Each structure stands twice: as C-alpha cells, then as structure tokens.
Design a protein around this ligand. Structure first.
Ligand SMILES: Nc1ncnc2c1ncn2[C@@H]1O[C@H](COP(=O)(O)OP(=O)(O)OP(=O)(O)O)[C@@H](O)[C@H]1O
Ligand SMILES: Nc1ncnc2c1ncn2[C@@H]1O[C@H](COP(=O)(O)OP(=O)(O)OP(=O)(O)O)[C@@H](O)[C@H]1O
Ligand SMILES: [Mg+2]
Ligand SMILES: [Mg+2]
Lengths: 53, 504, 465, 75
C-alpha cells in the first residue's frame, strides 16, 4: 500500500506538471503561417458542412 | 505509460464539429435562465451552456424557453450560447457505476476517472403499470433484528425511514447496504442485491465518511453513490433522486435486484420548494407547491417488483424523512406515508435512553408484512410481536406495581428481555440465521433467568457455541426452513447445557 | 381543424388553430407521438389559441407540432365489454388483454341529472361493521365518504366494503383508482380474479376497473375519476342497474386540479387551492347519484392533508355525502381498528323512522357516553381516576368498554393481524351495545371487549381469562 | 483523413515533454515552488503515515519477534 500510494502521488504530480507545461508550451508556440493554415482548414470544413446536407 | 494514456485521451477526444441549433440567454437569475431561440427544442430536453453547465428546458413559451440550470447561475451570463443536446434529460446507467461516486448528472466526483457506460436512461420515465408488477414475496435483509422481525421489508417495497434528526436513519440505511455483502459474495445470483445511495442536501464530509465506511467493509463493490450535497444547487438536489432511481431501474429491468435509499426526501422537497418559489408558483401548505406530492409519488412508484415476463427484477426504495419534534402529522411526512408501503419510525425519547436502533415498535408499519420473510423468521417474530404487544399493555402497571401478579410479572420480565434483544450495535448487521436463533431464545423463555444487562454478551457467546459445536442444528433448520419440535427439544437442551456451563 | 403547439409548461399545453377553434372540453390528439397523447381544451386564450391539459407526459413536445381536433370530448368505452377489464383515463385497455371491442362510447364530461330525476327513498345498507352499522349507517343508494389521514386505514376499510357488500351484490361494480398506489391496483386486480368477481375465462365478470394512479401526470389524475363515473353512469342509465362505485381516493382529483390550476394562470385560492375547487367538485359529485332510472351506491375514500378536516378539499366534500365515516389517527394509535371517530361520523339516515327506535336510541346512547368520556378525559389526564366515586368511574368504565367493542377484526386485515375476520349482523350489534349500556357487562374486563365481533365472543373471551 | 493540427501540436508537446523529462532523469520540467512544496508534503505525509522514519519501507521489513508466553502449570 505504501508503494501504491507513492506511485499514485508521483503519478499525480507528474500529471499536474505535464499539464501546465503543455498549456504554457502550446500558448507560447503561435505562428502566423500555421494560423493561416488553420483558418483555411476551418473555411474548408465550413464549406464541407454546407455541402453535407 | 502515463504518456500513452495522455496521448490516447487526446486522440480519443475528437471535437466532431458540426452546426448545432442554439439559443441566446435573455436573463439569468434565481436558478432560471430565459433563452431566446431553440425553435425545435423538446420539453424537458437537456441543454448545454457555453460554460459547460447543463440545463433542462422546463417552460416552452412562444418567445423564450425557461431553462432549469443544473449548477450555480454565476457561470451563466446574458447573451451566452445555449446548445441543444438533442435528448431528453438522462443519466448514464449500467454496472460501470458500481464503486463510483457521482453527482446528480452522473458525472464522477471521486476522481477515479471516467465512466465507461454504454447506456443511458431517462430520469423522467413513468412507473410500471398494473400488469408488469407482481406481489412482493422476496425478503429484503437489512441485517437489523428489530427491522427484519417486526417491520419486514420485501424486494420491490417502499419502506419509509422516518424520525427526528440524529436518530439513526442513516445508520439503518447504511447497515442495510453493508448487510448485502454476504449475498453478493455468494454464487446465488437471485439473492444478490445492488445498492444505490442518494445523498440529498447532506454535508459533503458526511458523504465522504459514508463512502469510507462502505469501502472499509467492502460494500462499495455493489454500491452507487449519487451525491447532491448542501453546497449544490437546488435543481441538482431535485434531480438526484431521479438520477439514482434511473440507475436502480437499470437493475430492475435487467432481471437483477436493486435497493435505493433517498437520504433524505425532506431535503429534496425543500430544494423543490426553492425552485417553485423562484418560479413564482403559488405556495400552499408550509409554502410548498401543490405538486410536492407528485414530486415524491412519481419517484417512489418506480420502485416495484416485476413479473417473470419482465425478467423478475425489482427495485426497493428506502426514503428518509426528517420530522420536527416527532411530528409525523406534518405536510411532507404525511405525503410520503401515503405513498410508501409502511414506515419505520425512530423515536428521540428511545434514542436518549440508549435504545439503538430507536425503532418505535407500535408505530412501525410494514404493509407487505409477513408475505416477504422466511418461514423461520415469520414463525418466531409472530410470537414476539404478540408478546411485545402484551408487554405494551401491562407497561402502565409497572410504574406503581409494588405488588403485582405472577402472570403480569412474567409479561413484564419477558418484554424487558425482548426489548434488550432488539438492541444492536452500529455497522454490525446480522445474518438471518443468527437473528432467528437469538429471537427464538428470547421468545421461548430461555432468557428469563439471564439478566437483561448480560443479553448482548450471551448473544455473542451462545451463537459462537452454536456456530462451533452444534452446527447440525443449523443444517437441520436450513434444510427444513423452519423449527421442528424435535429441534425445539434439542435447542432446549443445549441452552440448558450452555447456561449451566457458564455458571452453576 | 389542425392546430400547432404554441407553449408547453408542465401538463398545460397551448395550441393555436388556424380556421376554427375546438370547443372547451374537446379532446385533441398530438400527431408525432408513438403512444396516444390526448389534450383536453380548458379555455380560449384569444388570438385563436386554446389552453389545454395533457392526459399524459408532455416531454418530447416541440413548439409547432401538429395537433388534431377530434371534434368531441374524451370518449371512453362503456357497457358489458368493460367488465373485468382495466382502462386508463382515455379508455385504453391497460390489462394487456387486447382491445375493448364495443359499439358504445360516452364522453367523460356529462351534465348532472336534473332535479326531476331524483330519488328520495332511503334504505339502510347493512355492512357488517359494528361502528358503521350502529352510529353512521350507510344508505342503500347514496354517497358514502371515508375521511382519514395517511395510514389511519381507508384502503383497508374500502377493501372490507368490497369484500362484504360487493361480493353479495345483485348488480355491477366500478372501481376508480384515483391517484393511489399501483401496487394496490395490482393487489385488488388479483383479488378480483381470485374471488371470481373478474372472470378471465368467460363473460361473468361483475366489476369494471379504471385506474389513474399517483405516477400519472396531473391531467390524468384530475380526469380518471370522470372515467369511472362514465362507466357507472352507463350502467345506471342505459341498463337500469344498481351500481357500486368505489373511488380511492377522491382527494387526488381535487389535488391534481390545484396542480394544473397553477399553470392555468389563475389567482390562487385559500391554502393555495384552485379558485374553482367547489365548482369542479360539485360538477363531479352531482353526477354520482341515484336517479329514477337506476341507483348508484358510491363509497369514496377521502384523504385529508396533515390530518386537517378544516382543509378546503375535505371540508367541501362533507356536504356531498349522505353518510360520512371520519377515521382518526388518535383512535388508530390506541389499537382500535377500524379507527372510526364515533363523534364525527354522520349518516343522514340516523332517524327513528328509518332505522327504528331501538337502533336510534342505542346509537344516541353510545354517543352520549362517549361524549361524556371526552369531557371527563381532561380530569383523568391531569388529576387521575379519582372523580365522583361510583358515578364518573362507571361512565369511564362503560365508555372504555364501548370503545373496545367498536373495534372489529376485518377479513381483509386477517393477513397482517392474525385475528379472524368477523361479519356481525346489525341485530347482534345493537344487542351487544344495549348490553353494555344497560350495565349487564360491568363485571367483565375491558380487554374482553377488544377485537371481537359478537357480544357472545366478548363473554367467551372473558371466561377464557 | 487529415488530422487536427491542434491535435498534432498537442502530440508534439507531449513528445517534447517526454524527451526533456527523460533527459532530466525523470525530474519535473520547470516546476514552480508550490509544486515542489506539494511533492514534499506528500512524501512527508506518506513517511509519517507508514512509519518510514524507523525502517526502510523500500526494502524488506526487519521483523523483531519474540517467544510466545506460556502460562504456568498451576493457577
Ligand atoms: N445502533 C447504533 N449503535 C450505536 N450508535 C448508533 C446506532 N445507531 C445510530 N448510532 C449513532 O447515532 C448517531 C446518529 O445516527 P445517524 O447519524 O445515523 O442519524 P441520522 O438520522 O442520519 O442523523 P442526521 O440528522 O445527521 O441525518 C451517529 O453518531 C451514529 O453513529
Ligand atoms: N381494519 C384494520 N385492521 C388492522 N390494521 C389496520 C386496519 N386499517 C388499517 N390498518 C393499519 O393501517 C395501515 C394503513 O392501511 P391503509 O392502506 O388502509 O391506510 P390509508 O388510509 O389508505 O393510507 P394511505 O394514505 O397510505 O393510502 C395498514 O397497513 C394496517 O397496518
Ligand atoms: Mg442522516
Ligand atoms: Mg389508501
């Protein structure tokens, strides 16, 4: 039970640490060329939903 | 490992973007959001707010839609986007909820991960009619001596646990949940019973301590805890009995048997009165709405025993009602008494005197009665019910009876042993064979020489001697299903031997 | 014509029509529902919009859903084809025995019979219950109410009346389960098929069951009593039969009306009830009567909320009943069953010229001793039994013997009591209370008078002690 | 069958975290002080709960047993 709770405590802090690391890394990594590509994909997906009727 | 789980959760949570029919919040306040739009929305359909809160479309009006918010109304602002879920209000159901603590919407709150249920069931399903039901004939073993003998509960019955505050209403309900471990561990699936504990308006610390008690006693493996505590919104406390009932109706409709406890319905009526008064509905008796009877009647009527053509399953309800100064003539308890199949009344006066559980024998009714208990228990508890009634009649003569007749003294002495017999410690439910043997000894006169202050110690030691030295007696009782006069003579001899061996 | 749903609030649905409005009390059928959802028109709101009350659940209804006008009120099957069958508020069979094939239908809304079509004859209906037969006798053809709280015993009392009266009855019976337990409906249905009153094999059934229970929406619970009336009205009028109508219980009709009235936009009346409490009850109760064409003996269980007889719904029901039987919780807590209050039950046939001089004098003598006991009970409670030596103690001793002797074991309560059920002829009842009033049994213990029917079983119980 | 670019970006951040964590020997990456206080609080609580001060819980516990007590022949 001690090893299980130690593993659970280490798993919980690693999950919390990787969550805030991913949030900070995703927010700090914003590029305009990828933003325009995602904008074009959103327009194409909107056009695909209009066709799907 | 953890990275792989994190990756598969990202890949599995695809957005699946599509255009949804949406509305706009006009005004939010008093737990009711008025929403402009949603032309094709259904009555009582679940919605999603932009903050993640769910809501139920209560009022459909020409210009707006009145939505009952299942959460705090500080997360909703005017002008938010309200999306149709496309489905009438429903909760997850299944065997994946066993061992899990959930809120009124079915979302897990114990932090053990998501719920892998593949089925959902509406919370506003109507009760079964006349034909699919059948008479209640299978026993519900609460493990309590005073309950299982004097107020016997069956499978498919609605038995009210009513009393004042801090009188043991939760203690009776939790011990009934714990007692089913002996049937769930066995291979006989027809005696297996799943449990649903619905906590309405309680303290969240109290629910956590209940879950700890169920986990230590290993009763959590077959228990679902639906929690809508005192910090939760009134719509959540209103919805939680119906959410738990739907989870219990899964077992009823699939050939299994479920027990559900509403702890307590008096707090759900307070939560529904809050919703009704904030909706400007006309208050009635004690400011309650007129449909506060239909609030509990449509809930409890779903607890039924099904016929063999419907799988033979059942749902057993144990609603809890808290009275004020022992007033069972108030509006809300009288409503639930007119719904359920009998009430178990807990007395404050008996609770102060040390009698635990403080069950009022004369004021506890089981409308099903002896039709749903074993032959051995029914044969013995019938005699104890008569003897307790005889002791009750002559209890007025004990106040001044300095000189009293031998017959009346025997009735008083027998009633004292029978009253001390029904006492039972908390979190220790008893098997039905142990209950039958102890009640049989106290009702045949074996305890007339044993002092009433040593009955509980005699209860441990004599049952241990039976479980060790005279197991053939229990095998004969289990084979016959009752008590034979030959076994009566053998039990007379081993009682005389046991009392002589203890002292002479 | 064809309408569309404008607003759904609970059991109340607003439907807007284009060409012609349906009249009030007309039945409307919602189209896109797999089971039949029936709306009953209640009022015209203006702008070609009517406000209706649904007879089933309103979940899944969208605004703009098409609603069809049937052109008539709710019509239910009536006749011999309804005997042995169970039907709901809208006449659909819920016994899973197929459709109710009949050529006769009748609207559940009908005018009460006029003043000319009234029968003034009153004859005593002997029950076998000593407290009922002595103090508040029932009329053979008349309205009987069973007032009581929750658990004081009204279903047991009305099941005993079915066991005693309806078994040996030359006619038809109708049971209207109005907002009660579905378990009780299943118990009564199997009691009928076991006692032979309902025959699933041939056409010898004698009772029609109509059930709208407490799991039903308020629209169904406020109209299912009218469906039971319509079956009983057909038997009285179109066949000239003597009909028994058991309603359990009629308070749920009024209670469901108050729940709908909150959504009908009405200013609430006293204790939150509907403004039309007396008029809706009066319209319903005046249809349950004996006319010159036929007779209806109606027994109506009446729930009182919070054990309050001054509540508007039981109080307005008191004037609609020939005989009232008020059940008390204080008497039930004393172990006296049936817990009929002797000083609160009336009959309207308790007359020397109807039931006889000796029956009337014994009943008035019993009530006089019990009223004197109630006056003395405050001295007994605080001070004690030391009062007036011989005189008041004799009053207390006789009154307590009478209170025990009013109790009686029921045949329908024999399962959970153990005492065998007793059916006591009314001659033995008045003889038994005359012996107690004359002082012939003052030496017997008062335990001997408890839970025994005839007075010969009282003296036999005293000798057994 | 084009995947979401945010999903691909999230997978790249997971792989970047995993590469940096394995390059740090399993240690946390740019953890704040409160996370360090949280980790120390959990380790101290587990040490006090299971009694890790007296004996090493990672290894096999060293049992210190004793001979059972037998009553004398007479009373
Ligand atoms: N049979 C018993 N033996 C010993 N203690 C008991 C017994 N029954 C109840 N108790 C104790 O009495 C107290 C009150 O009981 P419990 O909390 O179950 O009552 P309740 O009606 O749920 O009160 P609440 O108003 O908090 O819901 C608890 O501390 C419980 O442990
Ligand atoms: N005649 C009787 N003899 C013995 N016990 C009785 C009798 N009448 C009622 N009781 C007791 O009272 C209980 C209530 O019975 P019953 O269902 O008739 O009450 P009720 O007034 O219809 O209540 P509810 O509002 O729940 O329908 C019974 O289960 C029984 O315990
Ligand atoms: Mg409690
Ligand atoms: Mg009843």
């Amino acid at each position: 039970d001690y090893h299980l709770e130690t593993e659970r405590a280490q798993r919980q802090i690693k999950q919390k640490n990787m969550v805030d690391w991913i949030v900070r890394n995703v927010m700090k990594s914003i590029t305009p060329e990828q933003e325009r590509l995602m904008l074009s994909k959103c327009i194409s997906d909107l056009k695909a939903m209009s066709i799907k009727a | 490992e953890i990275s792989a789980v994190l990756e598969e959760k990202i890949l599995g949570a695809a957005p699946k973007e599509n255009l949804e029919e949406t509305g706009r919040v006009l005004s939010i306040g008093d737990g009711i959001a008025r929403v402009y739009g949603l032309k094709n929305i259904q009555a009582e359909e679940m919605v999603e707010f932009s903050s993640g809160l769910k809501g139920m479309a209560l009022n459909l009006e020409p210009d707006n839609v009145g939505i009952v918010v299942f959460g705090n109304d500080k997360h909703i602002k005017e002008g938010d986007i309200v999306k149709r879920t496309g489905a009438i209000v429903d909760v997850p159901v299944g065997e994946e909820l066993l061992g899990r603590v959930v809120d009124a919407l079915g979302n897990p709150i114990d932090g053990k991960g998501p719920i892998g249920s593949k089925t959902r069931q509406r919370v506003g399903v109507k009760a079964p009619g006349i034909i699919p039901r059948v008479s209640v004939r299978e026993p519900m073993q609460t493990g309590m001596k005073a309950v299982d003998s004097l107020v016997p509960i069956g499978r498919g019955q609605r038995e009210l646990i009513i009393g004042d505050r801090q009188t043991g209403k939760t203690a009776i309900a939790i011990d009934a949940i714990i007692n089913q471990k002996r049937f769930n561990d066995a291979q006989d699936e027809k005696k297996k019973l799943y449990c649903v504990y619905v906590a309405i308006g309680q303290k969240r610390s109290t629910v956590a301590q209940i879950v700890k008690r169920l986990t230590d006693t290993d009763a959590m493996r077959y228990t679902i805890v639906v929690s809508a505590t005192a910090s939760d919104a009134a719509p959540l406390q209103y919805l939680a009995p119906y959410s738990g009932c739907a989870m219990g109706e899964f077992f009823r409709d699939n050939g299994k048997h479920a027990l559900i406890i509403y702890d307590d319905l008096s707090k759900q009526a307070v939560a529904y009165r809050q919703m009704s008064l904030l909706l400007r509905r006309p208050p009635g008796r004690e400011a309650y709405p007129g449909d506060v009877f239909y609030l509990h009647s449509r809930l409890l009527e779903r607890a039924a025993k099904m016929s063999e053509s419907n799988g033979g399953g059942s749902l057993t309800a144990l609603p809890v009602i808290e009275t004020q100064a022992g007033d069972v003539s108030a509006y809300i308890p009288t409503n639930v008494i007119s719904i359920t199949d009998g009430q178990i009344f807990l007395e404050t006066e008996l609770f102060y005197k040390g009698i635990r559980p403080a069950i009022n024998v004369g004021l506890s009714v089981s409308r099903v009665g002896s039709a749903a208990q074993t032959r051995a228990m029914k044969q013995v508890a019938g005699s104890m019910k008569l003897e307790l009634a005889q002791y009750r009649e002559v209890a007025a003569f004990a106040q001044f009876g300095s000189d009293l007749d031998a017959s009346t003294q025997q009735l008083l002495s027998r009633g004292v042993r029978l009253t001390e017999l029904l006492k039972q410690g908390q979190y220790v439910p008893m098997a039905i064979e142990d209950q039958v043997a102890i009640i049989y000894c106290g009702v045949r006169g074996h305890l007339d020489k044993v002092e009433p202050s040593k009955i509980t110690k005699f209860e441990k030691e004599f049952s241990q001697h039976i479980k060790t030295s005279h197991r053939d007696i229990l095998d004969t009782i289990a084979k016959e299903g009752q008590i034979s006069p030959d076994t009566d003579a053998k039990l007379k001899k081993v009682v005389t031997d046991f009392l002589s061996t203890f002292q002479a | 014509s064809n309408g569309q749903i404008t607003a759904v609030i609970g059991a109340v649905v607003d439907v807007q029509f284009e060409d012609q409005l349906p009249p009030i009390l007309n039945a409307l059928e919602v189209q896109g529902r797999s089971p039949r959802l029936i709306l009953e028109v209640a009022q015209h709101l203006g702008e070609n919009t009517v406000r209706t009350i649904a007879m089933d659940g309103t979940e899944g209804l969208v605004r703009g859903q098409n609603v069809l006008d049937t052109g008539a009120p709710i019509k239910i099957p009536v006749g011999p084809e309804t005997l042995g069958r169970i039907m709901n508020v809208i006449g659909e069979p819920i016994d899973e025995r197929g459709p109710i094939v009949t050529d006769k239908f009748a609207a559940i809304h009908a005018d009460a019979p006029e003043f000319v079509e009234m029968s003034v004859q009153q004859e005593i209906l002997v029950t076998g219950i000593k407290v009922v037969d002595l103090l508040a006798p029932y009329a053979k053809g008349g309205k009987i109410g069973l007032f009581g709280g929750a658990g004081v015993g009204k279903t047991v009392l009305i099941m005993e009346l079915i066991n005693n009266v309806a078994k040996a009855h030359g006619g038809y019976s109708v049971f209207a389960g109005v907002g009660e337990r579905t378990r009780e409906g299943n118990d009564l249905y199997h009691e009928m098929i076991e006692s032979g009153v309902i025959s699933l094999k041939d056409k010898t059934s004698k009772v029609a069951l109509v059930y709208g229970q407490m799991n039903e929406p308020p629209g169904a619970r406020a109209r299912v009593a009218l469906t039971g009336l319509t079956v009983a009205e057909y038997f009285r009028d179109q066949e000239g039969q003597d009909v028994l109508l058991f309603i359990d219980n009629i308070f749920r009709f009024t209670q469901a009306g108050s729940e709908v009235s909150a959504l009908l936009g009405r200013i609430p009346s006293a204790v939150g009830y509907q403004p039309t409490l007396a008029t809706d009850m009066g319209t319903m109760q005046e249809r349950i009567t004996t006319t010159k064409k036929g007779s209806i003996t109606s027994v109506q269980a009446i729930y009182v909320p919070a054990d309050d007889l001054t509540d508007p719904a039981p109080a307005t029901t008191f004037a609609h009943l020939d005989a009232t039987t008020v059940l008390s919780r204080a008497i039930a807590e004393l172990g006296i069953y049936p817990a009929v209050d002797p000083l609160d039950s009336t009959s309207r046939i308790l007359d020397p010229n109807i039931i006889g001089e000796e029956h009337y004098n014994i009943a008035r003598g019993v009530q006089k001793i019990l009223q004197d006991y109630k006056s003395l009970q405050d001295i007994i409670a605080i001070l004690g039994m030391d009062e007036l030596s011989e005189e008041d103690k004799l009053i207390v001793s006789r009154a307590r013997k009478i209170q025990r002797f009013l109790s009686q074991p029921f045949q329908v309560a024999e399962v959970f009591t153990g005492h065998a059920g007793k059916l006591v002829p009314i001659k033995d009842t008045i003889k038994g209370f005359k012996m107690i009033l004359n002082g012939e049994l003052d030496h017997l213990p008062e335990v001997a008078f408890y839970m025994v029917g005839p007075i010969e079983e009282v003296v036999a119980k005293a000798e057994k002690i | 069958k084009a995947v979401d670019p945010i999903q691909k970006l999230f997978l790249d951040k997971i792989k970047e975290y995993d590469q940096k964590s394995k390059a740090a020997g399993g240690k946390l990456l740019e953890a704040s002080t409160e996370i360090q206080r949280e980790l120390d609080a959990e380790l101290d609580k587990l040490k006090k709960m299971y009694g890790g001060d007296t004996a090493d819980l990672s290894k096999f516990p060293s049992f210190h047993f004793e001979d059972p007590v037998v009553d004398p022949i007479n009373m």
